[PDB]
Amino acid sequence: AYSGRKIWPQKHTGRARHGDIGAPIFVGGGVVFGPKPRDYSYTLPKKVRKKGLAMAVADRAREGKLLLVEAFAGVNGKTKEFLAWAKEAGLDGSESVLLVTGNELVRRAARNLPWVVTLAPEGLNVYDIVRTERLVMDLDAWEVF
Amino acid sequence: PRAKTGVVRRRKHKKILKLAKGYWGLRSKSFRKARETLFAAGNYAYAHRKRRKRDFRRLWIVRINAACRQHGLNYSTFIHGLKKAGIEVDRKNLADLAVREPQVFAELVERAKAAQG
Amino acid sequence: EAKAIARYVRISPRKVRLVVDLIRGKSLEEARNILRYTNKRGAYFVAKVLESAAANAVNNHDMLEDRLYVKAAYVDEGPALKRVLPRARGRADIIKKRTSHITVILGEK
Amino acid sequence: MFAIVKTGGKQYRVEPGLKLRVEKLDAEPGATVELPVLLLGGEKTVVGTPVVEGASVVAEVLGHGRGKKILVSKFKAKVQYRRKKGHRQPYTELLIKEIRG
Amino acid sequence: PVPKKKTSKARRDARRSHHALTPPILVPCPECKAMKPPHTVCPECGYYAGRKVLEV
Amino acid sequence: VKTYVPKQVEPRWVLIDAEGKTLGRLATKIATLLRGKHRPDWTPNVAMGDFVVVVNADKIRVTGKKLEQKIYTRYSGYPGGLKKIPLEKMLATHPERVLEHAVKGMLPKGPLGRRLFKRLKVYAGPDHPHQAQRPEKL
RNA sequence: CAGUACCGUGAGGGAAAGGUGAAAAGAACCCCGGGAGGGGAGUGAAAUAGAGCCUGAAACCGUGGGCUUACAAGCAGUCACGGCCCCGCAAGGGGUUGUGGCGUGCCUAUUGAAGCAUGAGCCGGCGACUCACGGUCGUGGGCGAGCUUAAGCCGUUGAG
RNA sequence: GAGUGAGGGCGCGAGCGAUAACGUCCGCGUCCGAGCGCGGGAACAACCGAGACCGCCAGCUAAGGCCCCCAAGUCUGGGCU
RNA sequence: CAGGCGGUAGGGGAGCGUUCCCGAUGCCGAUGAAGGCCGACCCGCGAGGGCGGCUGGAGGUAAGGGAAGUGCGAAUGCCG
16 A cells, blocks of 8 residues: 555554554455455366266166257247247256257257256356256267267 | 454353343453353352352251250261161251151161160 | 423533432422522523423323422433643643433323 | 152152152153162151161152153353363253152 | 543442432512512512512 | 251240359350250251350359460550450459450351340349340259 | 545645435424424324434443342352242242352463553454465375376357 | 473482572472362462362262361370470 | 373364355245344254244345355454
């Protein structure tokens, strides 16, 4: 704060000791380093970006996985109709699920995917699947060789 | 992420407040003060534990020697009158059978003593 | 039921106290008079007080003079106005001014 | 009339069928009629004889009707910043019902 | 000189009980009802001696 | 929960004394008699006991050679002076007064010590006025 | 409505001070009346809703209540039988205290404390080793003679 | 992975000192400190005993005690004060 | 079941109390979140946790564990 730089007396002083106008004693003075924009940059690899979901879904297949690897629904751009294949398939907002659709097509379509996935590109979101269940894929190749 | 103070402390010292009701000076209106009594009152309440028992105890002791001297006999050796007997009991508290209906004790003299012949 | 007020003063609340315990437990008569005719501040005020008190309490509250007993009041204090005191070597001779407060009450006989 | 014996470092006496407390001791609720030994009686309307023990071939009908309850206490060190409490207390307490001998 | 502590309210009312307001006095009057105090003048009863305000 | 509180007592009464009572020596177990010795209901907190006296107490069992061999002094001075008096003195000054002291040395104390004392009639009668009992024990 | 009040001589230096409500709808009227500051009424879901008004604790306030007290000695509180006013049919639960017992506190220093060796206004409220990076022993692990890629580039709402 | 030498009281060996000090240096033993929580000690950490969560209107004994202010024979002698 | 248990610094075991995360297009919630005054029941050795009443006036975040400007009587401290 470029403080008034040094101030009061000594010996006597306002009884209370001091010299440094940094006064880290009030609700506006210096203190300590609690945060730091350094939200710390730690991480890992793909040598695990794999194994994880492996064992997970297996048991999530004992749940009811499946995944046409590529299925229609209709206008692939009109939300409703997509779900029309939700029912003509066997799903309904309850036990949650997700999926990978590498095409803008159903993307610029699935719009608001509550209780559901609506992916397309690739980032991987296992977690949210935890709060969900079943699912579908875009070719084993799309997942990654 | 941010964090402050708030209400925590007061509570921790409010406990005292409640336990302090009835005390005199600051000991009835202070966290560091009443705190400082939870120590006196505290330790002395508990502590006064051995105290309280140590009280009602010997209290028995005398009232006992008191009228036992009436019938004649007296403590120490008296207790013996019990030993030379055949067992030993009464928890000098029960020895209240002198408070209400003592001639009960009377025989007890005849008891203890008689072992010496 | 025979009541008024006693707040928003400019001075010493403890100086009132006994002025009331002086005329507590009495009756409308007692107080109104005696004290009204008793020097040393307080008077000129507690006065206008009792006038409005039972004036309405015997208005939009319908009471009865003469019988209105002197319940009591609420010996209490108020706010202040700040002003420091100069001195030798411009020291710290400081203060303000305690105003006063308290309550007004009598009843139906 | 009165009567007397004990219950583990605690000598008691009674009259008819009263009961309050004296810690806890095994044997389910008060569905049983448990009873130990004794020593004197009550020099009055019926007696006048203690002697060596007395609990020889003689006991006392101590009814049950359990009601075991968890009480409370309250501790803390206290000295010179060595008051390390963080520990109140309870203690046992059984509720049953006597009879006699 | 100078002390070093804080005042006690106990001693508060203690030494100040003798402050129990000692109320003034008063008496009757003649004509109307100017119940005046030991030697005074008021137009509530006027009087009948020297001559001040009014009487009836 | 045995208590012992009988709900009051109302102390006893008795009488005694003669040229053959060893002053002081007796004292001790004397008061230890009033408070409520024979008083079973004796709940140390309450103040029972009796109500006793000592007539022809003047000069009673002159004890031993305490005479001249003891200066009953406890009256502390103020400017630099208190009191003294030995045996061949007090023995004189209110014989009753005297005896009082001898014991006064040890005695009990507190709201209780005080009360159990109230009843301390003595002197050198015999015959204890304002009486209303006195089962004297030799 | 502060870089102001303000303190300065310059430089300089620096304050306090957000919160009625859905809507001011912001008080009509008439008896206290010095304007002030009152009571009613009304609006008003809400006046323990009205202008240092949000909700409003705490130090400091007694009205007024209840239990205490003028032989009396004390870190004071405690433990004890007892009595003394609310509540439970009962069991008791209470509040307080008589006396009796019992009682050297508290926060910092050191052969050595309670201590007139310091500090302690008082209550509230703010207050102190993360973390970066860097070094280095353990821990669930995976790979495991093998075991780990920066700075970018497509791409990432996001992610990658 | 941390304290660490600013210890001292007692007793003994022993040097200091006017067998001068609740002192100094060591040794050592010691326990206080760190056991100012017991108890005795009349009141007083370092001297003796005794080393610590419940409940106790429970009992046995060591230090240590039995006229008083509070506990248990003004016991028994048998003398000697 | 023998045992252990005072114990300054130090060094372990946890647990507890204390503000963002997803859970939060899940769930209480005006027959109330939240503050509170009160609670003399229950659960917590404790940490506390409750747990229910009356004043209280607009939101809360489950199990879980994932992050920590706190776990503040005080320093003749800052301030009010």
